[PDB]
Design a protein around this ligand. Structure first.
Ligand SMILES: C[S@@+](CC[C@H](N)C(=O)[O-])C[C@H]1O[C@@H](n2cnc3c(N)ncnc32)[C@H](O)[C@@H]1O
Ligand SMILES: C[S@@+](CC[C@H](N)C(=O)[O-])C[C@H]1O[C@@H](n2cnc3c(N)ncnc32)[C@H](O)[C@@H]1O
Ligand SMILES: CCOc1nc(N(C)C)nc(=O)[nH]1
Ligand SMILES: CCOc1nc(N(C)C)nc(=O)[nH]1
Lengths: 380, 380
């Protein structure tokens, strides 16, 4: 009954992730002044460039040059030696108002509770009892390895580290009546951008001793665990100079690491009317409520919408055989306890609050007790 | 045992899809001259602009202005009245060589069969016996509805149609020992860009009579089927003018429509060394071979890689309880029949051939008998 499963994560300076963080810095800057801002901000990053493209209709007065540069500074790209510098990069803006055809069909003259979905689409929520935070261990460990790299870079322990990193964790699991039980870590990959001076052996030793051992419990590591540390051999060129980044290109890192499913929508740079974000957060909230409520050990929830229509078109539950209740019964419990109209989700999850840049690295789920991470007490 | 499941698809003129098609037109233009081109071409589209950003190392001489404009012409954006025009749009290029640090770690001085994966990552393949092509009915129908719109636009039946469209199909299924059986179509959404002259009732009638009835079998449609046709009410502004598009933002439309799983990687604009594409195609090939080989009714396959390492780090099989054989036994069959090194996949799936622009709309799977759609005869 054993099997392997792999998930990855990336650091704050991974170019796709830079884009997600900038998109959400822009969203938060708008929401700080106009809680009802309509934002659809895409970011593109390549050598020396941040380009903002999309549609924003807002009463806020936002200084895009300042917001973008401050986000890049926070990430740690502050010198041409690192391949990117917030002080001297090009910031280009191609932002227009939201299409009036979309606005009239979604929200104009609509009661907030009855606002229409901002687009059609499908979204999934997932939760698993394998960790207290109800997330897959593979992705939790992968995120923590990138967070550890950023911690050691920022406190000056490993000053040769640069912001761009990727990690990947393969866990060997046992199947248990549809639930999954982590046994051991089979393989770890770490690739991180570095300075010109540090040698490969010094990096590999530090990645094992100061990063992996500082994150992964020893009980999961053994003589057979495979380590791929700086497997490319050299990673001096990094960030946007090494690879063009775009918003919404790390949607699996943002969610469940391959577990569960995804509807395709990106989160960053979007206000609550874009159900790609708000309904995915609500679906996570439902899934976690079902697991913490003791109704199943793991569960997948799907929801879908049509543009301009408030109520979801469909809701579905897949419990992997981990409940005594049928999926039909769980769906009835969900329908009695949740209202997944976007105009209700916004109230329940406080989605006009400018906390979005905090979600844009290290995953949107399983951290920091955001509203979608606080289970709802279910009545049935 | 009944449940609902929803999938979406988009048309050739959806702005994200325009980007995927342009990225793959660029890839094919390079491969026509240099079969070993290293391509990582991202495209961004917004009002009046196509921007190419990324990394290409190739011996080809490619006229980016001509390649981009020809792709936009094919899609049908040929007049400012449509919101976008290949003849007069801005084409901007920010393309540099592939990072030498990546090149040295992946492919330089390597025997082709032993080339390293171009990046780390995870990829999934899926197949289901619910259709002959081994794809979920939800996504097959959603794709065919967009293809029908483009057919009626191009033959002049519905001259008010414009290239940008989205569709969404919800099917009611029955569960059958882990397999899924389509019963009926519960809800259909169609949104399509249109001219200023046509009225809503004429469009809704045409979408039902000339589009849905021309695609979806009557046996699936009944008095209860819900139709959301032009639900926003007005969609004159469309294409990149209505919404910024980016390459790799329709990864679920490109694959399984919410069924199965996704590793996060985009396909378009990437040569075979980028396992996000080649290993996902090979995983589809494995999954379809297992279903057509009669070993399971539906199956999910995961593979993963480390940058610079040829052999996958992990391979896993989830058969949803639809095989008499254990997942351990199916994994042994896969390991005896397939070699998922990128330098072998390229040979088996002929991945230096310039057929990629053909994959960039209507899904990469379940169509046209591409090599990954031709099952391998399994020996065990
Ligand atoms: C390998 S690059 C993607 C392929 C690239 N676009 C190309 O031109 O081949 C993807 C990510 O891997 C990381 N990366 C960049 N250079 C790397 C290197 N030399 N070694 C390992 N990882 C690298 C960065 O996080 C980057 O965003
Ligand atoms: C609704 S837009 C996404 C949200 C948008 N960025 C905004 O500013 O609100 C997403 C896709 O829906 C389609 N779309 C654009 N305008 C539309 C309209 N008026 N009615 C329906 N669908 C529309 C296009 O395919 C577009 O790429
Ligand atoms: C949340 C709905 O997703 C799924 N449901 C099911 N069943 C069998 C109900 N199978 C899947 O593969 N996905
Ligand atoms: C292909 C590996 O994906 C999965 N495997 C399993 N099991 C139980 C083997 N459960 C999942 O949710 N996904």
């Amino acid at each position: 009954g054993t099997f392997l499963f792999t998930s990855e994560s990336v650091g704050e300076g991974h170019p796709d992730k830079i884009c997600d963080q900038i998109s959400d810095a822009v969203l938060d800057a708008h929401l700080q002044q106009d809680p009802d801002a309509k934002v659809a901000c895409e970011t593109v990053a390549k050598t020396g460039m941040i380009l903002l493209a999309g549609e924003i209709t807002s009463r806020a007065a936002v200084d895009y040059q300042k917001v973008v540069r401050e986000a890049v500074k926070h990430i740690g790209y502050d010198d041409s030696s690192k391949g990117f510098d917030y002080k001297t990069c090009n910031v280009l803006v191609a932002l227009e108002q939201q299409s009036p055809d979309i606005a009239q069909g979604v929200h104009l003259d609509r009661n907030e509770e009855d606002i229409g979905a901002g687009d059609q689409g499908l979204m999934f929520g997932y939760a698993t009892d394998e960790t207290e935070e109800c997330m897959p261990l593979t992705i939790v460990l992968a995120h923590k390895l990138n967070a550890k790299l950023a911690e050691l870079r920022r406190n000056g322990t490993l000053p040769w580290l640069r912001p761009d990193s990727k990690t990947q964790v393969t866990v060997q699991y046992m199947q248990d009546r549809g639930a999954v039980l982590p046994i051991r870590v089979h393989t770890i990959v770490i690739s991180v951008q570095h300075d010109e001076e540090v040698c490969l052996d010094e990096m590999r030793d530090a990645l094992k001793e100061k990063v992996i051992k500082a994150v992964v419990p020893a009980k999961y590591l053994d003589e057979d665990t495979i380590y791929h540390l700086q497997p490319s051999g050299r990673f001096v060129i990094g960030g946007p100079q090494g690879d063009a980044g775009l918003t919404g290109r790390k949607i699996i890192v943002d969610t469940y690491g391959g577990w569960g499913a995804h509807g395709g929508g990106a989160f960053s740079g979007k206000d609550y009317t874009k159900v790609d974000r708000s309904a995915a957060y609500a679906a996570r909230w439902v899934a976690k409520s079902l697991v913490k409520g003791g109704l199943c050990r793991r569960v997948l929830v799907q929801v879908s919408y049509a543009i301009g229509v408030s109520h979801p078109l469909s809701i579905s539950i897949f419990h992997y055989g981990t409940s005594q209740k049928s999926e039909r019964e769980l769906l009835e419990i969900v329908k009695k306890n949740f209202d997944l109209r976007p105009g209700v989700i916004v109230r329940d999850l406080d989605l006009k609050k400018p906390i979005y840049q905090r979600t844009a690295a290290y995953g949107h789920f399983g951290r920091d007790s955001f509203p979608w991470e606080v289970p709802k007490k279910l009545k049935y």
